[PDB]
Each structure stands twice: as structure tokens, then as C-alpha cells.
Amino acid sequence: APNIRKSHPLLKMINNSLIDLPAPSNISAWWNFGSLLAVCLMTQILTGLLLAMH
Amino acid sequence: MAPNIRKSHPLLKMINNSLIDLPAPSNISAWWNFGSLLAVCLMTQILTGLLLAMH
Amino acid sequence: VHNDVTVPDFSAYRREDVMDATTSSQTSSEDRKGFSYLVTATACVATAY
Amino acid sequence: GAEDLEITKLPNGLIIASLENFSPASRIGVFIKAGSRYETTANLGTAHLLRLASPLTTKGASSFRITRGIEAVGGSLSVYSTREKMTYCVECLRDHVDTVMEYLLNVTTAPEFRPWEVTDLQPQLKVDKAVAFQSPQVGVLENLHAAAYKTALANPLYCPDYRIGKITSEQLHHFVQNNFTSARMALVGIGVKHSDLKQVAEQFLNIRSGAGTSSAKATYWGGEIREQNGHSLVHAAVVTEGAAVGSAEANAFSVLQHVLGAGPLIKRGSSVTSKLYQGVAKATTQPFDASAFNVNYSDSGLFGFYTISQAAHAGEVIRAAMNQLKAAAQGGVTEEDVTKAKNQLKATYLMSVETAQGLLNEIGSEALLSGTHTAPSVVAQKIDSVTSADVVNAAKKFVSGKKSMAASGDLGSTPFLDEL
Amino acid sequence: AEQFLNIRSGAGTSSAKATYWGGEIREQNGHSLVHAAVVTEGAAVGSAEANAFSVLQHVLGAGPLIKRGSSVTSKLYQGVAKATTQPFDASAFNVNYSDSGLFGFYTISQAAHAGEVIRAAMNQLKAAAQGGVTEEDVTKAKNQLKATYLMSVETAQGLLNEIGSEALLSGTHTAPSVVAQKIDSVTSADVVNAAKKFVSGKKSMAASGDLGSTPFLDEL
Amino acid sequence: GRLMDRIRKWYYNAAGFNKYGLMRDDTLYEDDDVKEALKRLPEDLYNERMFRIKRALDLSLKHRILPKEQWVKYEEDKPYLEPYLKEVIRERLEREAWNKK
Amino acid sequence: AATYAQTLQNIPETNVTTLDNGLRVASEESSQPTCTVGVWIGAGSRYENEKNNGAGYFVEHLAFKGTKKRPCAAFEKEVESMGAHFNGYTSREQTAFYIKALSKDMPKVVELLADVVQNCALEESQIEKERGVILQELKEMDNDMTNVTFDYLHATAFQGTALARTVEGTTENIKHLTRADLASYIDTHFKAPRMVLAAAGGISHKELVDAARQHFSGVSFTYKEDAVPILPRCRFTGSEIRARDDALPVAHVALAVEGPGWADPDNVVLHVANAIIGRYDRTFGGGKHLSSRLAALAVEHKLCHSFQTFNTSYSDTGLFGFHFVADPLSIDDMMFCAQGEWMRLCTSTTESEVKRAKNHLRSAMVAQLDGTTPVCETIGSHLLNYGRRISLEEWDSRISAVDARMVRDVCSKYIYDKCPALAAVGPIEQLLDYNRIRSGMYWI
């Protein structure tokens, strides 16, 4: 394959779910909570660890 | 979709292509057993470890 | 040609009961499976313990 | 039980044949005057596709119920067809006739040719046609009728390539509405009582009277079509316009056929009673096969020989087959050879009717292109009533007439029609 | 060429003589446009009878000289034009091979009109074979031919092709004035005769399209 | 009767898909039957539905609607798929019923 | 009109009369002007040994090249000239030579038959020709995957035994077989007690047996002569054989369990079972609506080019299974679905399925008596195998007694958890592991 974004076993996964992934042209703001939920999660874990160390 | 649900299902398909219908050389020896052991070993540590961390 | 093809001899490996080419293997089948399956079943019992 | 063969002929011209042989099984059929013969450069293949379309939904039954329903009683359902006749038959045990009949009636008289069902089906022509052409035997015959004619009969039996997928629900409908007309159709039926088969044909067979589209006369071309394709085996067929169905000269050729030789009677055996064979045998040394070819069509026919042989020997082999035809056209026919053949022919005919299939075919063929049934003794009286001359003359007509040749294989050493 | 080339000597495999068959091959393929080509044994290369045909070619007409224009100087074209009403094209076909050649006409036309169109192209050949050639038509063609020839060599390609062709099937170079002297040295008869040779010889035809209304070689 | 024959016209305007220029049949959830039905639509009715739909989607992303003039009128709505969809379900029900038998 | 039930009773009975030399004469008299008569022999490659393998075939090739009373030219010409058709065959456990002619020549035919089985010429010069020809047919037949496959299926399912050999024999055997060996084979196997003169069409049983007495003379002296030899039993083996060649367009696979053998009543149920699974092939128009589940799947998922079930029986054993033809990449799914259907047979057959399967099977048995040759083939075989004729009226009685509950019990008994025999030829990489296939032999 030409570009390493499609061939690589890992980038390919990142690409098929966050870059070349097909999305409806009309999704509204109500479709923003998925990522927030995700980000929200990474934040809890991060702050949580920092707290667990004390 | 596909005849058997072991190939169509988004999850089983993953289990299948890595633990059931996965192609393996016919001649790998015992030295190739340590991978699974390492894996099993890891699950065991986590399991016993949690049980210990609760006290 | 495929007519010149024959299965090698598996005497060196056949079980005792299916060793004779002029005897129905079916009679001894239930035996051969009940044994292998008995081993397996046991393994389960031992593991279930 | 053992008697008769009734045959009514309804108002609209719909012929109804029948015969009860108390066979534990029935076999009803609908014969029709239709085929690639009525095709025009504009709707080619529509005959072929119509053949494969038999299982598609009909106004009375669905694609589903047709197949399920028939199989439910261990029935069957097929469509056999020549360049000028189409037969729709179904078999089943005596007690399921009435059931299997529904779909038969429905298929032949009330199709729907739904656009989609039809679109999904067409790609099949590519397949169907592919298995047929697995036998070169079928390739040269297509190209023969193409060199032997300029129309109607010159039309191929299997949908030409470029037209796959381009046929339409219209074309099918019109084809059906213009040919599947009561005056061109016959409802034959072995294994059933005449009153019953009659009652059916009545209250139900709707698409009434007419003769619709009439086939254009069979002009003769006399062309030569060659196909270089590499095959180690060359097939060749050289013919001349022969007799037509119901021709007085027909029985003459059929006889010159068996005289020259047409088909072996002994497994892996040599054919001595086959002059054509025996002649070519003396000619070449390597394996081959040669036979008397003979086709009888409504308004025309074809006659000659067909030969299979190793490429490098098709030359000597074809010539041989020729000389043996000239030699036969010049009185090279014993009064006994005429006797032998006549037997081989009567036997062949008589054996060809032991089959539930072969019988119904025979009966129906008449009931359509006639309206009657020539007793077996009559057909026998017609056959042996053929002089030793009629034969030699037939032969002549061949050595004289304009020949049309079809050949396919490694033709590198195969002769051209004008070198014979 | 010398101190370098090495696969050498002799003329190896020799081509089998060009026998003539005179067959008719038809191709039914659905195309709205039918192409047809009817020819007869023409003339060989280096033959005297060559020039004659080349000329009968331009006389019957072979290729337009005016964009989107009609060809009046083309009898064959003009003839067929009068014949049909719909679009088409017709030309004089001419091939010259070592030991043989091919000559006739080629016609493109709507399926339903290939019948009237091919006939037309024929009549215009019979008509020409029966002295239907002015002494001037022979003059016009001869010019169109000398021009065509002379133009065909402005190209680096066309030039080398011309030069090489001779140097192989000859070993010399016929001066441009000599080829000109050979061309106009063609009587009004040679032409009509050429035409004859066509109306008489055994014809071979090739056609492909919706041939449903196309004629067979024996119907011309 | 001609009672709910009014209610319908009411609901039809209430919904408001016509403000997007969509036919009632355009808004159908594409389950299995509807999917088969759509395969039977003639080339032309198919491309029309396609444009109507893609048009609606573009309006949705833009957060606009069609000018009042272009709104599909209750009585001019083409039930273009209903015919096919109805048959597809019958066929299915035939099969379903026959396989129990 | 009349019912299937009745048309089945009014079928003329089959007469059987044994001679003194042990030969059995049987026939079914019809109203037909044409007929078929021949001799079905209980001989074949199974009766061969390691050194004469293919003799019975080498004989089938000379059987028609003339007898002593009348050499080649004469023989052929005499047969042809009377419009009669001479044909025959030879399998693992059964050979046959039969003729199709006018009921008129029935007696002259019989003389010819008797002359062939009893007086084969075995011209030393002819043998050196059929040797070259047979060697040809071998090279041809080698290119017919379906048979290379079934041969291989036997070559292993019965590995190490007689049923393991091909009917055409080996190359060596054919290159060296002798006038002596051929002679021997004929004198050893073609014998009255082991033969049956079957006739069908328009013929008087009595006229037949008469002409029979007159031409089949050879009267035995010792007991050995009129004793039918019992064959040593063949052992079935669960196993596989994989002849791979990725260069072949499609792949062939055949899988089977051990069968009961001619005599067992179960064979009826087995056939009813194969009726449920059926067969398919890309030209079947019924398509995705076929009643055969495997056929539907085959269609829906483009599983194969064709497939067939079969219940090949033999005296003491048999092969029950299936054979399909597919593209390299659909081999696994097909096999998967197929074995699946077998498991359904053992665990969840429906009355609806058997009901239909029975109607199919009936029309089938009936269709096997459509002509004089096919009715003669039946007679020759029935006697030879069941020691008598079985009328459609009977078959039907047995077939009608079969029901779901029954089919399940039989199939379970013959298929469930058995170790099958597998034969695979072609680009078979995607079909794999005997172990995986063996495991497909249990749990629905």
C-alpha cells in the first residue's frame, strides 16, 4: 500500500476510527457526548491516579 | 451474513482468527509454549494480586 | 494415473482391534471411542475438582 | 388395461392428445411452435431467456410456491426446446397430477416477468450457456445453422453474448403474447384419462386463438464458418439442404443416413454397417469419428456428415467422408444395404419410445405439426417403401447442391468447402 | 550496422504464398453502426497495375480534404450520398502486399441503411468499370495522389518510413520525380480496367454491427 | 370515514418532513423489507429518492429548511414505495407460513 | 382415473425359473415390440486379486471383439444388421452384457449372449490392441475428477482390502495381463449359478427359458462347480487422502460413513434421508427456493458448483455420504453446512421433510423402470442382490412406513460420532484437519 496510514497494523486502526472513518454530514451537537465521555474518562483515570498516590 | 456465526460476529470472529481457525506451523516445538504461559501467568498475577490488594 | 495410487500400510500404528483387514471395525468401534472418551471425561472430573 | 390414444381439437385450435398406459406416473406437457426461429436481430436470445424464466412468479403462483409446491409431491418441471418448438412438461405420481398442473398452466399462460426477477435471472444465461458449450459438438452446430442460413433457422439457440442482460420484460411478454397462442400450442398427456386432460385445457387455458407472428421463410445461404481455437480435435460438419418435416424425401434421407452410418450399436465396437465410418477408417490410422448428419425442420432441413479427428488428419478424414458420399450417389448402394438400414431405422424408432419422455415427445410432435397420430405400422409402411433409387438420388442431391461447412479446432490442415 | 550487428545471413523461414479464398465473415454485435468492406484481389507491391488502382482509389474517393465538408471529387461518396439520407461514410480501400493486394470500398452506416448504402457503393464501381470515368477525373486524382504522397513525407516519421520501405523491398530510392512520372503515366483505360477487374473478380466481404438489414456477398 | 381523513392531513403537517422536500416514504426506517422494496424501484424513482434524501441531509447539516413554496403538499405526496413494500411483506408472510406447514 | 395404489398392483409380475446348471432366468413381459435382454454376472474387481486386477475390465473390452463360433467381422455385422444394440459394463461387484432388439429376435439374441459369456474368442492379436486402448482410457479417465475422487474414497475407506481397488485395475496389471489370465478369469467367474438371464419387453417367459435351456448348457459335475463363493469381508477405516494440485480450477471433496449392505432394510430409510438433503447444481432453476436446505445455502452463499448425496451399497458393506465440487475459497463453508445437515438428520428431522422426501424417493424408484433396459437392469440386480425381485408395490409399502422418528434413529445409528472416510482432490488448502471434520460428526 502507498501511504503508511493504511498499511501499518496500528496506524491503520487509528485511521479507520478517527481519520478516514465515514460519518454522516449532518450529525448535530448531540453526537459530541461520545468523545466527551471518552475524554472525561481519561481525565478521571489521570486525576484519580494522581490522588491514589497520596 | 456468513454461514457460521464464528466468522460473521464482530467479536467471535476475533476470537476465531486468533485461537481457533488461526494458521500455525505444524512443527512448532515446546519452546513455543511459553507465549501462552506468559499470558496465563499474567492473568494469574492480576487475579491473586487483586485478592491481596483487598487486604 | 490415479489407478496406480494406494494407501500405505498403517499396521505400525493401527490399534489392536482394527489390525485385521478382514474384520469389521464397527464391532470394536464403541470400545475404541468409549475408552478415549472415558479418559477425557475423567480429565474433566479431575479439573472440575 | 391396454387401449387407444384419443385426441380432441378444441374451438380455438388447441389440440389435446392423450393416452392411458396406467403407468404409476403421469407426464403432462405443453408443446408450442416457438423458438430462436421467430427471433429478430432486435430481440435475439429472448427465446433462451424465456426458457430459463419458467420458475419466475406467475399471476396464479409465486416463484416460491411454484418450486416448493412442485417439490412437495416429488414432482419435476422442465423446458426443452429446439430452434422452432418449446415444450413445457412436468412429471409426478398419478395422484398429484391436478396439483402439478396448476403451475404448468400458470407458467405457460400467465407469466409476470417482473422487472427485478428478470434482471436477477439474466446473468444466468452466461452460466447456462457456458456448460452447454463445454461440448464442442454444440459449438459447430450453432455456427452451422449460421452458415446454412440467412435467417430464422440461422438464429442461434443460446442467447448471444452481447445481448446478455439487455433482454426486457417487454420482449419476453410480447414474445409470449405473439407465439404462445392456442392455434400453435398442444396439450399432450401420458398417464391420464382424456376427459380429464380435456377439462383442464378448457376452463383454464386462457390466452386464446391466434397464430400471431409468423416465421420468415427459411432462405438458404451456403456459407462456410471456421473457428481456429487450438483444440487438438477438429470437428467438421458439411451439409446441404435436405428434406423438411413431413416431406416424402425425408424418409429417403433418414435411410441414406443409416446407410452411410449414424451412431454405433456395439460398445467400443467398429461399425461395418456404416459405409461412412468404414470408409474413413481405411483413410486414416489415428482415432476419429464420422457420422451421417440429418435434421428435418418445418420448412427446410439439413443433411450431410459430421467428423471428429486429430487436427493433422482432418484433411484425409473429411475427403474420405466425401468420396464415400459421391461413391454412394453413383449407385454404390446394394439393395441389401437399403434393407439393413430400414431395419436399424425401424428399431431405432421403436426403441426411442420406451421412455416416458420419448413417448410423449413422439405423440406431441404430431399432435402439433399435424393434429393426428400416424400408427406405428403406418410409419413402418412409409419407411420400407423406399426404393434403392430414392437413396442414391438423395446422395446425388448432396453431391450436387450448394454445401455449407462449419469447423472448429486447430484447422491448420483442414480443407475449405471449395477444396472438396 | 557492421561492426555491431550479428544474428545473420540468409533469409530463413519463407512465407507461404498468399492463396486467395474469397470468403464472407459476418459479425452481429448490436452496434447501431454497421461497417462493411467488400474487396477483390488487388495489386501487389512494385507492380505496374499498382499505380492504376491507387488512382482509381482517389477517383472513387478515399478520405476527405475539407473539415466537416462534403466530397464532390469523390464519386463513391457522392454516389452513396444520393442513395441514403442519414449519416454515413464510404471510401476506396486499397492495400498493396509483397505477393498480393486488396482493393474495394469500406462503408460505415446506420444499420437499417447499410443495404441501400452498400449497393450504391457497388453501382458506383460498376458504373466506373463501364467507362464512367472522365479524362479529367483521372487528372484530378493524379494530383490528389501526388500531393498526398508529397505531404506524407514532411514527418520525420513519414520520411524514414518512405526511405526504409524501399531500401528493404528494393535496395534503392526512386526519386520523387520518377514516382511522379510513374503516376501520371496512367491512361484513362487502366483505371476503367482496374474497376472491371473488381466487378469481375471473386469478392470477399467483412461486416460487423446490427447486420439485420445488411446484404450478403451474393446479393450484390 | 372522512373524519381522520382530516386528522391525517393535520399530522402530516405536524411531522414536517415535507419542509425538507421529502416524501412520506422517504422517511421510512430501512429495515429488511424496506431494503428489498427499494431494490425493486425503477431506476428513475430510485435516483429521485436519492437526491431528495441527500438534499434533506444537506439541509440538516446547514440547519435550514426549504422555502414554504417548495414544501411537499399533503395531497401531492407520492407513496412511491408503498406498493412494492406491501408485496415484499406478503411474499415473506407466504414463505413464513409455508415453512411451518 | 385409476390410482397410484392400483397402477402399482396391475404391474405384470416378474417370472424367475432356475435351470439345472444353476442359472436363473427372469423377465417382465410388456406389450412392447422392442425389448432388452442380457446376463448380469456376480463378478467384478472385488473378485480380483492383486495380480489379475483389471482382468474383468480387460475382458469387457474383448467380450465384443468376437467369439469362436463367429469371429470379429461376422459377430459385429450380424448384430448391427439386425438393428440390435450391444452394450455392457463391469463394476466392483457386478458385471453385465445386454442387448436391445426387437421382441422378435429375442431367441437369436439369447444365442449371441450365451455365445459371448461362454465362448469369448480372446484372439491373441486382439489383446495387444485393447491393451493399448485400455491404457488410453486410463489417461482419459484420469482427467475426470469426480471418478478420481470416488476411486480415492474407496482406495482409503476400504484401504488394504479388495474393495480398495479400481475397476480398471493398475497400469502394471494391464501391461502384463495374459491371454491365460483373461481366459482364467472367464472360466473362473462367468458361471451359471453366479449368472442371471434377465429380459424385459415383449417376450414370453417360456419362450425365453426355452431358448435358454438350449444355449446355456455347461452342466456341473462336482459340488464346487455350483457353489457360489462367499467373499472375505472388507474393513472400513475412518481416514483421509488428500491429492492436492492447486493448478486445478475447482476442488472435489467426498465424505462417507460405512453402509449396511444390500440386504439391510435400513437402506430404505437411508435413501429417504438422502432425499431430504438431495442434490444441487448451478443449473437447477428452482434456486434459492429449493426445499433442500443445503441447496438453498449453496445458492444463497455461492457454496458450490454442485453436490450429491449417495448410498452406494454392496453385498456385505457400503458407502453413505456426499460429494461436492467447489471453488478453492468456499470449501470450508460448504463442508461446514453439509456436515451440519447430517447432524440435523440425526437430531431434528421433521415429518414435513420425510413426507416430501418419500414422494421424491417414490418418483425416483419409478423413474428407474422407464424403459426396457432400465427394467432389465433392475431384474438382473435384484435377483443377484436380494435373491429375488422387489416390486414397486413393495418398495412403496416400506417407504411409506418411514417417518421422522425413524429417520433420526437410523441416521444416528450410521452417522453420529462416526469416524468418516474423506477424499479430497484439487486446490484443497482451505479444507483442513481430519480432526476438525471428525468433530463435525457430533452435536447438531
Ligand code: HEM
Ligand atoms: C470512572 C472514573 C472515576 C470515577 C467516576 C471516580 C469517582 C470518584 C468519586 C465519586 C470520588 C469521591 C471524591 C470526593 O468527593 O471526595 C472518588 C475518589 C477517589 N478516586 Fe476516583 N473516580 C474515578 C476513577 C478513579 C481512578 C482510576 C483512580 C485511580 C486509580 C481513582 C482514585 C480515587 C481516589 C484516590 C479517591 C479518593 C480521594 C478523594 O476522595 O478525592 N478514581 N473518585
Ligand code: HEM
Ligand atoms: C505482572 C504482575 C505482577 C507481578 C510480577 C507482581 C509481583 C509482585 C511482587 C514481586 C510482590 C512481592 C511479594 C512478596 O514477596 O511479598 C508483589 C506484591 C504485591 N502485589 Fe503484585 N505483582 C503483580 C501484579 C499485581 C496486581 C495486578 C496486584 C493487584 C492490583 C498486585 C498486588 C500486590 C500486593 C497487594 C502486593 C503486596 C502483598 C504481598 O507482599 O504479598 N500485584 N507483587
